[PDB]
């Protein structure tokens, strides 16, 4: 909108080009994580945690 | 909305399959006799003249 | 039997069994039928002056190179052989014309149609020569309406009167002007309507200007023309109708793929009437080795553009299918399901190709699916509305939008335009640097750093702590 | 096995045969206390009264 | 605002009125590019 | 609408407008190419049956069933009932501000 881009014109932070959708926890819960497993397709480089 | 135009004249089934048959008892013409027309099994007069 | 179901596969089963099938000599009398009315049509048409021309004019623009010859012929009974077989034609014509001055002229019916008779046309422009005389005759035609409607009707003229006249001479003036003193109602009430009639025979003697013949000869060929033409039609339909049952016998193999039995054994239908028109008994094969060719292929290529919501070309129906009969004879020849990777040096493609083709949406799903285990829950009660703004983010607007407007005000009328400009703020389009110079008088240059100086007031504590709330 | 006969005989003798072992399908196997994991989940078929 | 509901036939010109164009093929989207 | 995976979920009155469209589609090529009556008049047949399952499917004859073996809602369908437009959505609504 303009007053969005005139607001970043003004604090000079421009904006990202990835969204952020990250899994979190659901609201109420809290546990302890005990077990990751972690499931990747035969084309793609595996990260270090896999 | 939009429309589609029918290449031929289509019977409303709401008028004619509806027990009371509107478009049966306006013509006088029995359900019956009008579904055999509808199914192109049967011929029937218009206006032939006395 | 009528009417007992409603069923409507039943009905066309009931309506089409009643057609014995033919035997191999009846088809050969069909097809004989079918070659004597095309033959009668084009007799019709190979005796009229425009075929001739608008042929000598496409020869002509082929002389040109503006049209190919194989887009105007469909073979002979060799581009060098084309071209002279054009010139004799083209000299029959014009020798035609210089002898066209009636009793030579007989002759040169039957001379200039035997050069014309022996091009074999294309189906596209032949119906052109087709349609130049049915424009022909609706034109001739309608003055034929108007002349029965301005003399009969109006002045009450006997109707065996307007066929002992006009019916026989149809170009003289016997029953317009001659047919005043015969002492008759009509004969003397004629004046009254002689200013149209007359001029309505101009536009229908200017017909005889058109292409050279003569009315009669319009009607004496037209009549032909429509017997050919009735005469081919019924021959066709008598063949398409003994056929109907090889179109169910194909029609049932596809009958779970998207489409309905009646919309199979309808699509294969239109396929019967194609092969109908292309079949050839000199080369003595039965009609059903033809036919299941063009039956075949008419209902396959429908399964290709109606039986999916998301239609996928059928370049790519011929890679799904091609897929999915390689990826079940590998099933049987390692006993389990193959990957992506063993399918790509089996087809002969990358893997990037069959990835794709993999993932090529299915049918979707519908939403009237019950997703739980009851009838109440479906598949469309769980599918939300990703199109609006939340009233926490509509809210936020309403608040950045009052921001900006206070703080916009504890700056100079003249920064406080030129933002409102820059940004399209409470108005509509934004404008450039050089479209807000022309509304101030001042250069491009200047307003850049007026703006500039009014964006460095903002960052100023004070007048910026609200502000920075907003991200 | 496929066998195919000889024309010219009610159950004459065959000219070829081909004995091959053909796989058809995967049928789930229950485990040790009577269920079945299907995909990942352990299920139970219930018997049925009719 | 409105006072009442009313309910009838519709004509062919009505159909027509109400419509703002014809749909003429049977396809929904591009299988490649999800465009209508 | 697509959902998450690359599969899309639809309504059935499209497989019912688009069997419409191709039927009428169908009629006008046969009346353009002047085929045999009984052709004709088994395709009139088959527009006045897809027309009359999409306005009451089952009504006349039996129900089209879709890729599910179950008989595709119509816009009949949509209005009558226990979960019809009336009863489900206009005489009671799910509601903002409220929990159990
Ligand atoms: C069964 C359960 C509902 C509880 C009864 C869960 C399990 C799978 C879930 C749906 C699927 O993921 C597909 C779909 C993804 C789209 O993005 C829109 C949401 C959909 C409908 C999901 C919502 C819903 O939660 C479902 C039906």
């Not at chain 2, 027990?19 to 206006?47: A, C, K, Q, T």
């Not at chain 3, 939340?390 to 607007?397: E, Q, R």
Request: aromatic fraction near 6%.
């Amino acid at each position: 909108t303009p007053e969005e881009k005139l607001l970043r014109a003004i604090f000079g932070e421009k904006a990202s080009d990835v969204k952020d959708s990250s899994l979190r926890v659901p609201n109420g819960v809290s546990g302890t994580v005990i077990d990751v497993q972690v499931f990747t397709r035969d084309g793609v480089e595996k990260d270090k945690r896999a | 909305m939009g429309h589609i135009e029918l290449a031929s004249p289509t019977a409303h089934i709401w008028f004619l399959k509806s027990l009371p048959s509107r478009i049966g008892l306006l013509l006088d013409m029995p359900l019956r006799d009008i579904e055999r027309v509808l199914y192109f099994e049967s011929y029937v007069v218009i206006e032939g003249g006395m | 039997e009528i009417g007992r179901t409603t069923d409507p596969v039943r009905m066309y089963m009931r309506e089409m069994g009643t057609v014995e099938l033919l035997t191999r000599e009846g088809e050969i009398d069909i097809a004989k039928r079918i070659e004597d009315g095309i033959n009668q049509v084009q007799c019709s048409v190979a005796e009229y002056p425009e075929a001739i021309t608008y042929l000598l004019e496409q020869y002509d623009r082929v002389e040109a190179e503006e049209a190919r010859l194989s887009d105007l012929i469909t073979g002979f009974v060799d581009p060098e052989l084309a071209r002279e077989k054009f010139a004799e034609l083209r000299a029959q014509y014009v020798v035609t014309r210089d002898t066209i001055k009636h009793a030579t002229a007989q002759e040169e019916i039957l001379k200039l149609s035997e050069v014309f008779k022996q091009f074999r046309l294309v189906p596209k422009q032949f119906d052109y020569l087709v349609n130049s005389m049915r424009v022909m005759m609706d034109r001739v035609r309608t003055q034929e309406r108007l002349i029965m409607k301005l003399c009969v009707e109006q002045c009450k003229m006997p109707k065996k009167n307007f066929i002992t006249l006009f019916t026989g001479n149809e170009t003289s003036d016997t029953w317009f002007n001659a047919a005043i003193a015969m002492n008759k109602p009509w004969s003397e009430k004629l004046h009254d309507v002689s200013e149209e009639v007359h001029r309505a025979l101009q536009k229908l003697q200017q017909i005889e200007e058109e292409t050279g013949l003569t009315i009669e000869q319009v009607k004496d060929i037209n009549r032909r023309m429509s017997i050919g033409e009735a005469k081919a039609r019924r021959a066709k339909k008598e063949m398409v109708e003994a056929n109907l049952r090889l179109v169910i016998s194909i029609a049932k193999k596809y009958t779970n793929r998207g489409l309905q039995f009646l919309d199979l054994i309808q699509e294969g239908n239109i396929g019967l009437m194609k092969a109908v028109d292309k079949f050839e008994y000199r080369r003595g094969y039965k009609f059903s080795t033809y036919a299941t060719w063009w039956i075949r292929q008419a209902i396959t290529r429908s399964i290709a553009d109606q039986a999916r919501t998301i239609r996928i070309p059928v370049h790519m129906i011929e890679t799904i299918n091609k897929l999915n009969r390689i990826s079940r004879q590998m099933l049987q020849e390692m006993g389990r399901e193959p990957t992506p990777e063993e399918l790509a040096e089996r087809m002969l493609m990358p893997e990037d190709k069959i990835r794709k083709v993999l993932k090529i949406a299915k049918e979707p799903i519908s939403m009237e699916t019950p997703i739980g285990d009851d009838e109440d829950s479906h598949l469309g009660d769980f599918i939300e509305d990703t199109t609006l703004e939340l009233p926490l983010d509509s809210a936020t607007t309403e608040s950045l939008r009052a921001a900006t407007h206070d703080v916009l005000a504890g700056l100079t009328a003249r920064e406080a335009k030129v933002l409102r400009m820059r940004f399209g703020i409470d108005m509509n389009t934004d404008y450039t640097l050089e479209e807000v110079g022309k509304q101030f008088d001042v250069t491009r240059e200047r307003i850049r750093q007026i703006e500039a100086k009014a964006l460095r007031k903002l960052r100023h504590p004070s007048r910026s702590e609200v502000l920075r709330s907003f991200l | 096995r496929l066998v195919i006969y000889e024309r010219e005989a009610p159950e004459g003798t065959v000219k070829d045969i081909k004995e091959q072992e053909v796989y058809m399908g995967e049928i789930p196997l229950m485990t040790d206390n009577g269920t079945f994991v299907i995909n990942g989940t352990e299920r139970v078929i219930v018997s049925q009264l009719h | 605002e409105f006072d009442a509901i009313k309910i009838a036939l519709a004509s062919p010109d009505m159909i027509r009125s109400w419509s703002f164009g014809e749909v003429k093929k049977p396809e929904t989207i591009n299988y490649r590019t999800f465009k209508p | 609408v697509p959902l998450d995976g690359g599969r899309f979920a639809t309504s059935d009155l499209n497989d019912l407008y688009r069997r419409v469209i191709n039927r009428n589609n169908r009629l006008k090529r046969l009346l353009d190419l002047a085929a045999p009556d009984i052709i004709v008049r088994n395709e009139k047949r088959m527009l006045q049956e897809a027309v009359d399952a999409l306005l009451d499917n089952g009504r006349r004859g039996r129900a089209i069933t879709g890729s599910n073996k179950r008989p595709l809602k119509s816009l009949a369908d949509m209005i009558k009932g226990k979960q019809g437009r009336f009863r489900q959505n206009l005489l009671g609504k799910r509601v903002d501000y409220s929990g159990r």
